[model samples]
Target: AQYEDGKQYTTLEKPVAGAPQVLEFFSFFCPHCYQFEEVLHISDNVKKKLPEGVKMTKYHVNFMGGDLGKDLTQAWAVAMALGVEDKVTVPLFEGVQKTQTIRSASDIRDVFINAGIKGEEYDAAWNSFVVKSLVAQQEKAAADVQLRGVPAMFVNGKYQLNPQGMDTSNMDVFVQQYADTVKYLSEK
Candidate 1:
């Protein structure tokens, strides 16, 4: 593999099997996570070039924003369950990381409302079985990964990507290299 073990990537203690998976652990409060999406747009760009059957999942870590971390993660799960993640992610990011306006669960609900999701709908998914389960699963995954930082990427549930080692002098090259590594690692 062009991406060397323990450097560009690391193998999991227990490798998983199924469709290739790209699991990303991030936090709403991290400026780097915000920049990775806003400045570099790495998530959208890398996603476009992934191979078929590659499942990309984003998990909001419960280590940021202190007491609000769990709420934010739940808010993320609610958006996903309601199929409004794409519509609400940017606003949430802006409010949480940039404007510093979103400080509570109510603020998160407001973002969803602004995105056209009804209050009733939002409330329903907030504590719904599926949504609760999703949040718990993400929290568990975050713990399992022993995440030390935001925007960590794990491929096929085994190979963990080290974006810090990747050349970022050129954003374009960085995005391409990151995606290429994911694609090749998925083929593993």
Candidate 2:
């Protein structure tokens, strides 16, 4: 469905009975999200250890603005529709993080190619209506979330942040704690 501005939420659908949900609010250009990518990836493993109904969903936020955000958002939407999320996510994150370069549509496409996705199919999906709609929805949802920063996490819709104000070195711990919190909440 096309995302209507000011209407749709990026939030996850209602949790299944006896399950908890994890919502990760992130931006494609945010350096912090890039830095936290490995931890986030590991958190996926933690998700798998949860009870049956518990789930984790990613919500892309576009705080970077300009064409970069638009391009990344579109790429993400396309990846989702094409069922190439796993193939693209890590590579995309690595490209943005390691290159220390601005992300563009072409850059995202390169990441997809590096990840073994066919360039032609990736191009077609990138321009699909489903991708456009998903991008639009994400843009709207980001606005609704009133995001303060990238890598912000929400467990069952509640925000999680480092309470000790530690430097970047402690981010992994924070992320793991947040993941564990989600698991704990799901059991309640």
Candidate 3:
């Protein structure tokens, strides 16, 4: 029997009948997201603060769709396909933000290489339609739940802790596009 390099990663569900849901919306390129990275992942530090039976998830924001957003999101999908997400996420942040120049898909391969991706794993993951498919779907996924900006969060997909003082739906008064996001809350 042969071991597989590909480990399946689970996507966030709509939240079950019980349990508080904690969904952290983020972008790898966002300076604030970088600062909040530790809290985003399910580390011991984050878990201790979580209420018992609370479910947690972190989503990389896909609305930006640039060298920063779409590019990294696709790279993340590929990395997940290769089963190296937990290992590569931090290094990916460093590479995208400061240490390396990862402008496109071509650069993504090497970044994975640096992150210790094996040849067998890399080939199967890099060009898989599944990677592209997941990348293509991210924008809609974010939009469906109103993930219009970075550092956004949710509780069980409800529009709690959301975006902008200004609404882009009324484009007549657009000020800071991504920087200023309004927060919507059900509970005081």
Candidate 4:
């Protein structure tokens, strides 16, 4: 789909066939997104129990840098290209939440280095066309989706899961309710 900023969304356009797709719009720097991580973890378990054809994808919003958004956008593109998502994303979140550190591309690279991702592999992935395209696509999707805040969820492109509407003191119930909503959507 073409987004407001004139970019196309490639990665999130289609759902995994027969599987309910969940897209999370979040920011590594946002405290609410950090707290929402626990829900994601619990939902992973719920995913395991789900009948085949359920998948989740995450898009990190990169608009905080004003005109520098594109620069940070490219940084995320590079990380995605490097296929170091699993290594960098959570560490980036922890760095932001625990150490109160803001990450740049170099800082993200350090996260990869510390996690044992090496030179050539990192370079090859970081420079690849796929990652670059994916990042561009993600940036567009974030804008097109009209995301109002961090830590939002979309189920199969039809329903939205809003964390703000739920009771915050009991997170487990909130998360379960969210997962159940997704489950209901999947079955429908």
Best by lDDT: 1
Point out the higher-scoring one by lDDT: 1 or 3. Answer: 1
The true-versus-predicted C-alpha distance at residue 144 of model 1, in Å, is 2.4
- Computed on alpha carbons, the lDDT of every model, listed in order, comes to 0.83, 0.62, 0.55, 0.61
Give the winner by TM-score: 1 or 3: 1
Candidate 1's TM-score reads 0.92
- Where does the lowest 10-residue lDDT sum fall in candidate 3? 1-10
How much is the lDDT of residue 167 in candidate 3?
50
Model 1, span 47-148: residue lDDT tens: 888876666788788888887888999998997788777898789889998898898888888989989999898999998999989898888787776777
lDDT of 4 by residue, 39-80 (tens): 356446447545586676767777654533444456566676
Between candidates 2 and 3, the one scoring higher on TM-score is 2
Query: TM-score rank, highest first?
Result: 1, 4, 2, 3
Stretches of candidate 1 exceeding 4 Å from the true structure: 14-20
The candidate maximizing TM-score is 1
Candidate 3 C-alpha lDDT tens digits along 1-188: 11111211112344333323555567777766665564333233344544557655555666654755766777777765666777777776776777767666666667678778876677676668998786765554566664556766555554344233435464323322211211112121
The TM-score values for the models, in the order shown, are 0.92, 0.72, 0.62, 0.74
Clashing pairs in 3: 163-181, 163-182, 164-181, 164-182
How well does candidate 1 score on lDDT at residue 163? 82
